[PDB]
Amino acid sequence: FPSIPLPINGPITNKERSLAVKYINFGKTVKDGPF
Amino acid sequence: SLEQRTLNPDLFLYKELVKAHLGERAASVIGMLVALGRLSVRELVEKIDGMDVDSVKTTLVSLTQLRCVKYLQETAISGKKTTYYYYNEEGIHILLYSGLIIDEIITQMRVNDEEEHKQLVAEIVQNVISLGSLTVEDYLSSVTSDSMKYTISSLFVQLCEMGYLIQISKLHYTPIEDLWQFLYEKHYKNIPRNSPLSDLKKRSQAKMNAKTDFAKIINKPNELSQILTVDPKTSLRIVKPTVSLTINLDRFMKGRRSKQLINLAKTRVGSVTAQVYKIALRLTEQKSPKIRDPLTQTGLLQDLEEAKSFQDEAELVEEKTPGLTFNAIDLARHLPSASLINSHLKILASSNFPFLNETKPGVYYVPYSKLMPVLKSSVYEYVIASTLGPSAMRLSRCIRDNKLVSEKIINSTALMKEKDIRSTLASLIRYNSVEIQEVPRTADRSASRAVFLFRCKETHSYNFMRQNLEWNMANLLFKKEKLKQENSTLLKKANRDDLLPSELNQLKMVNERELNVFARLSRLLSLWEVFQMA
Amino acid sequence: ELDIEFINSLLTIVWRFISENTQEILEFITAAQVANVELTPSNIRSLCEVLVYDDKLEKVTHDCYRVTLESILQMIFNYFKMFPASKHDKEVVYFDEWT
């Protein structure tokens, strides 16, 4: 319903798909931690 | 999603980000703190509903360890001591920026190649801040008795003494305004009665003594002479092992700032000079002017005779600091030719973008106090040129140099057809980039007998879109954990094995789509972080 | 000059003369059978500053002009070759829909 997106809508590159790995295991570290 | 798009400031970001990967009992307590400001635990209990008095303290000490809030104490004279609790602005940024701390360590530290701590130095950054505060004895007591611990212990002095791993204390852990309070009356009570003349000048005596000390108190954690132990046996250089430390974002934010400037370099010059500009900046990343500027955060910012003095000395710091003014003879050895490093640096003075602009002949240094507003003026305009037509880029720049333009001279300065600009300018009224100035021809503001003038209004024009991105940072990760609410019966099974054939596919389609999120979260993170250079 | 369009035909050629690198323009505009009837040094000053607002080229030393290297953009600050998915993806980012 709303138009005009941001210009950053692109296929993920191999420069940062390894960087996206470091997020999800960081959340699995802390949430499976003490708290 | 109309429920959320309307009545939610940045609190919609802060509430869910601690709800992302941390217990749910603590997401509601700091939502109460940010909403209502500051409060004690004793009357925290009735503001929330469903958490017991001791159950707050267990929840609050759970949130204390990651350095996400900041307490402050004041007592009553006839009463006991009370402890207020604030919200910490930058501690919650750490678990926001937590993915990007990892990728910078490898990029700043290129002396090693195919090391056996590629797994481990990325784990150590995940091991220094995930549990919260951390000291030396807590990681040697792991399963590894030695496993070359003397290499790994001495690895950190290379990694800590470059900065951004400063010993933790109460100084950065208590807020700055309240830190500025109790040192102000102490120097005000250093001068007693019987110094009668110029009572309105006697307030400056504590005020000038505050600035000398307030720089020294913030330098106590920056003081690196007390985090060393030169061990005369079996060692050459090691930190003090009884030191609690975490990350420090101050170098990281400056390092992210230098990551932003090289992109502006690669746009306004080709490929050869962009490789030159990156090398000289890395040498001076560890000591730079402060990006947050805690002295301009709070104080006597009211009066112009002092409000101008917050940048007169701050500029005078920048050019007269010995630790960055490079002589352009050091740079030729660090690249992997004294004429070329003159020639490629000669055009940095020629361009109207003031980086490596002004200098003493023979020495060179880049300024920041007159540069980053051009960076703020750079990333602002092209985003408008992306989200709508490039004609809107043309009208924005016409109001830049020509101030307060009417509707006749826009056809004299710029030149497009008359019916098309109104279908473009009105789009820029709606987003608060242009404004309206009214002049009344008749009495009582009669709307027909009036023409309407414009302005840039350089301060409102950024503050609109900074919250238009803070909400946009907050909107897409709501679809992260909401995506985890459905398909929850098999992620519990996928966390139990450590294998149905048709169910394995719907674990992949919920995997590459969230893989797109963190890439789309990183790209607009850089477009946002430029608006923190205040 | 004239209120109706086709000023761009005058405008797109004068960028090409500066791409290879105000008085130097006035001899070039006489030739090449351009459909003009009267030019003036004031008009080329007005014709050039539209490109300044687009950052197609730059104003230096009060009359000289250098190119802002849009040629590499012509052929993150890279808005070309950025095609979106836009279909069957609910997790997109919009600049509107905050108001």
Q: How determined? A: cryo-EM
Is the CB of residue C13 less than 8 Å away from at least one CB of chain B? no
Do B151 and B238 form a contact (C-beta atoms < 8 A)?
A: no
Q: In B, which residues are within 8 Å of A10 by CB distance?
A: 519, 523
Positive or negative, the Cα torsion across C43, C48, C53, C54?
positive
Do B481 and B20 form a contact (C-beta atoms < 8 A)?
A: yes
Q: Which two tokens stand for residue B326?
A: 């490079």
Resolution for the entry shown, Å: 4.3
Angle of the B460-476 helix axis to the B478-485 helix axis, nearest 10: 10
Angle of the B249-268 helix axis to the B372-387 helix axis, nearest 10: 60
Phi, psi (rounded to 5 degrees) for B253: -70, -35
Do the chains contact at A5 and C85, CB–CB below 8 Å? no
Do B33 and B41 form a contact (C-beta atoms < 8 A)?
A: no
Do the chains contact at B414 and C52, CB–CB below 8 Å? no
DSSP E strand boundaries for B44-90: 69-75, 81-87
> How buried is C66 (Cβ within 10 angstroms: 0-12 exposed, 13-18 middle, 19+ buried)?
middle
Per DSSP, what are the bridge partners of residue B437? Answer: B453
B66 min Cα distance to partner chain C (Å): 30
Residue (of B405, B469, B415, B465) closest to B435 by Cα position: B405
Q: What is the CA radius of gyration of chain C?
A: 19
Give CA–CA dist B259/B44, Å, rounded. Answer: 42
Within 15-34 of A, beta carbons closer than 8 Å to C belong to: none
Is the CB of residue B131 less than 8 Å away from at least one CB of chain A? yes
Q: In B, which residues are within 8 Å of C68 by CB distance?
A: 268
C-alpha distances (whole Å) from B464 to each of B75, B250, B454, B472, B477 are: 40, 26, 17, 13, 21
> How buried is B236 (Cβ within 10 angstroms: 0-12 exposed, 13-18 middle, 19+ buried)?
exposed
Do B422 and B441 form a contact (C-beta atoms < 8 A)?
A: no
Up-side HSE of residue B262: CA atoms within 13 Å toward CB?
18
| Closest in B386, B397, B520 to C53, CB measured | B397
| Interface-testing mutation among C78, C81, C82, C88, with chain A (most A C-beta atoms within 10 A) | C82
Do B17 and B37 form a contact (C-beta atoms < 8 A)?
A: no
> How buried is B122 (Cβ within 10 angstroms: 0-12 exposed, 13-18 middle, 19+ buried)?
middle
Give CA–CA dist B117/B114, Å, rounded. Answer: 9
DSSP summary character for residue B534: -
Amino acid of residue B126: Q
Do the chains contact at C93 and A9, CB–CB below 8 Å? yes
Amino acid of residue C97: E
Do B26 and B62 form a contact (C-beta atoms < 8 A)?
A: yes
Do the bridges between strand B437-440 and strand B81-87 make them parallel or antiparallel, or are there none, so unpaired?
Answer: unpaired
Give CA–CA dist B117/B346, Å, rounded. Answer: 41
C-alpha distances (whole Å) from B449 to each of B71, B435, B443, B444 are: 58, 19, 9, 10
Positive or negative, the Cα torsion across B468, B257, B14, B105?
positive
Q: Which residues contact B346 (CB under 8 A, 6 or more apart)?
A: none
Do the chains contact at C94 and A6, CB–CB below 8 Å? yes
Residue in the structure block whose two tokens are 């398909």: B487
Give CA–CA dist B482/B484, Å, rounded. Answer: 5
Give CA–CA dist B46/B51, Å, rounded. Answer: 9
DSSP summary character for residue B97: T
Do B490 and B220 form a contact (C-beta atoms < 8 A)?
A: no
DSSP E strand boundaries for C1-99: 57-60, 64-67
Do B179 and B171 form a contact (C-beta atoms < 8 A)?
A: yes
Give CA–CA dist C24/C47, Å, rounded. Answer: 14
Residue in the structure block whose two tokens are 């809107």: B392
Helix (H, G, I), strand (E, B), or coil: what is residue B16? helix
How does DSSP assign A2-34, residue by residue? ---B-S---PPPTTTTTTTHHHHHHHHHHHTTT
Give CA–CA dist B373/B381, Å, rounded. Answer: 12
Do C14 and C56 form a contact (C-beta atoms < 8 A)?
A: no
Angle of the B118-128 helix axis to the B98-108 helix axis, nearest 10: 140
Up-side HSE of residue A17: CA atoms within 13 Å toward CB?
10
How does DSSP assign B406-452, residue by residue? -TTTHHHHS---HHHHHHHHHHHHTTTSS--EEEESSGGG-SSSEEE
A35 min Cα distance to partner chain C (Å): 29
Angle of the B512-529 helix axis to the B98-108 helix axis, nearest 10: 70
Total length of chain A: 35
Do B397 and B389 form a contact (C-beta atoms < 8 A)?
A: no
Up-side HSE of residue B107: CA atoms within 13 Å toward CB?
15
Q: In C, which residues are within 8 Å of B513 by CB distance?
A: 89, 91
| Closest in B415, B479, B524 to C91, CB measured | B479
Q: Which residues contact C16 (CB under 8 A, 6 or more apart)?
A: none
Is the CB of residue C79 less than 8 Å away from at least one CB of chain B? yes
Q: Which two tokens stand for residue B438?
A: 């009214």
**Largest pairwise CA distance in chain B:** 90
Q: Which two tokens stand for residue B262?
A: 């090289």
DSSP summary character for residue B362: T
Do C47 and C11 form a contact (C-beta atoms < 8 A)?
A: yes
What does the buried/exposed string (b/e) look like for C73-95 if buried means 16 or more CB atoms within 10 Å of the residue's CB? eeeeeeeeeeeeeeeeeeeebbb
Instruction: Give the residue on A whose Cα is nearest the Cα of B515.
Output: A20
